[PDB]
Write a protein that binds this ligand. Structure first.
Ligand SMILES: O=C(O)CSc1nnc(Br)n1-c1ccc(C2CC2)c2ccccc12
Length: 435
């Protein structure tokens, strides 16, 4: 039925967005003896934190350096500011402490994802998306040979097992492998859902595609409340994977109660489609995974993203039916690109405006995804329609490369967002040439 696949391409969105909350990095500082030892450290904890940790980014105490000896020269206003030397610091050998106000436990606070290993979280997202790519590439022959229902049930069981395992992962590589297998099963379920919704009913293909997109949006909106309700990432993953264990009951229906010509032929349309899919993947899996910097409140940001993406992807079908495929797609791409660029243009103090621009950009890239999905069914004739598979593969590759460009934040906090805003502009300018 349609409602079952809607629930199960919600919970998939919930599982995908769980990385945006479980991998969130709270405000952390170096473990200092004058702040975490017994009472003998003494009053005025702010002064102790200032004299125990040097300043860093955003005029805040350095999250990566600690003073070996208390520098009393910094607290006295009669002494000059920034008088300490670099040799007085240490590379945080004693460890780090994290703020338990917003999140009680995360994968960053558990395995100490700090500046020395800050690339692990984008590397974790890249490994997750690589597992998605591997699953989407492998489940093809599996679904073609063993049947779609068998591979669907196996992928559901694998999802549940890997979620339950990652909810209690003792090490970082073990958690990475668990996420890799979970992404394999996620991509299997995604491919099965797509290939089933493409030919179950269909004239109603755009209608069922927009229904699946609205289900995805419902999942986007529900995962925010789920993360707001559960402050522990372990219990969060547990209660997110439990619905898959419940949906596993539908196995076996309650127990019975090649195509390489896409490159030479229509090469222009092919490369344009792969470029749009790559751009969509890039922006979506680079922006939806770092919502902490795009707004002030991650839960409210995701809620607004969902509540504004619902009508956007709703009216996307009206726009496609009235104005056409190419013009509305180019318009949505250019709008998303301009919004993400203005998100870097606006100062960081305008948090509400930054959040609104992020929501608008996410709605625009979702509308662009809907538009390219509708357009892929008509860009190529029936004799060439694995063009859609190549487009999805290019989108998954762009997704994989997504978190890898986030490492450019060392050279500047706007460079990843600058790329995420510049790519859709060129994507729309290239799609404007479509027939
Ligand atoms: O075509 C493909 O299957 C890969 S496209 C892609 N890239 N990042 C992501 Br999230 N997705 C997406 C993958 C899958 C879906 C739906 C549930 C079936 C999505 C729905 C809306 C937006 C993006 C989606």
């Amino acid at each position: 039925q349609t409602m079952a696949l809607m629930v199960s391409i919600m919970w998939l969105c919930t599982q995908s967005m769980l990385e945006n909350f479980s991998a969130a990095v709270p405000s952390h500082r170096c473990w200092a003896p004058l702040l975490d030892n017994s009472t003998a450290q003494a009053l005025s904890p702010e002064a102790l934190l200032a004299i125990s940790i040097p300043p860093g980014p955003n005029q805040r105490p350095h999250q990566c350096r600690r003073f070996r000896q208390p520098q009393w020269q910094l607290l006295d206003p009669n002494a000059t500011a920034t008088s300490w030397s670099e040799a007085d610091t240490e590379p945080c050998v004693d460890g780090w402490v994290y703020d338990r106000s917003i999140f009680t436990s995360t994968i960053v606070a558990k395995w100490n994802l700090v500046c020395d290993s800050h690339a692990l979280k984008p590397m974790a997202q890249s490994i997750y998306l690589a597992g998605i790519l591997v699953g989407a590439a492998a489940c093809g022959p599996a679904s073609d040979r063993f049947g779609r229902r068998l591979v669907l049930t196996w992928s559901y069981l694998q999802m549940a097992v890997m979620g339950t395992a990652a909810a209690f992962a003792p090490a970082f590589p073990v958690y990475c492998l668990f996420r890799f297998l979970l992404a394999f099963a996620v991509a299997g379920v995604m491919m099965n859902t797509g290939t089933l919704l493409m030919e179950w009913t269909a004239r109603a293909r755009p209608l069922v595609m927009t229904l699946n997109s609205l289900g995805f949006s419902f999942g986007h909106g529900l995962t925010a409340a789920v993360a707001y309700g559960v402050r522990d990432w372990t219990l969060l993953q547990l209660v997110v994977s439990v619905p898959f264990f419940l949906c596993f009951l539908y196995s076996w229906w309650l127990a019975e109660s090649g195509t390489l010509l896409r490159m030479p032929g229509l090469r222009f349309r092919t490369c344009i489609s792969t470029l749009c899919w790559f751009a969509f993947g890039f922006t979506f899996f680079g922006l939806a995974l770092d919502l902490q910097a795009l707004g002030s409140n991650i839960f409210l940001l995701q809620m607004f993203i969902g509540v504004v993406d619902i009508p956007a992807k709703m009216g996307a079908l009206l726009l496609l039916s009235h104005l056409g495929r190419r013009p509305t797609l180019a318009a949505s791409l250019l709008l998303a690109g301009l919004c993400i660029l203005a998100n870097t243009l606006v100062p960081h103090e305008m948090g509400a405006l930054r959040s609104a621009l992020a929501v608008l950009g996410l709605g625009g890239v979702g509308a662009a995804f809907t538009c390219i999905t509708i357009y892929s069914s008509e860009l190529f004739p029936t004799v060439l329609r694995t063009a859609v598979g190549l487009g999805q593969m290019a989108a998954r590759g762009g997704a994989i490369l997504g978190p890898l460009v986030r490492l450019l934040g060392v050279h500047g906090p706007w460079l990843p967002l600058l790329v995420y805003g510049t790519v859709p502009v060129l994507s729309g300018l290239a799609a404007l040439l479509l027939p």
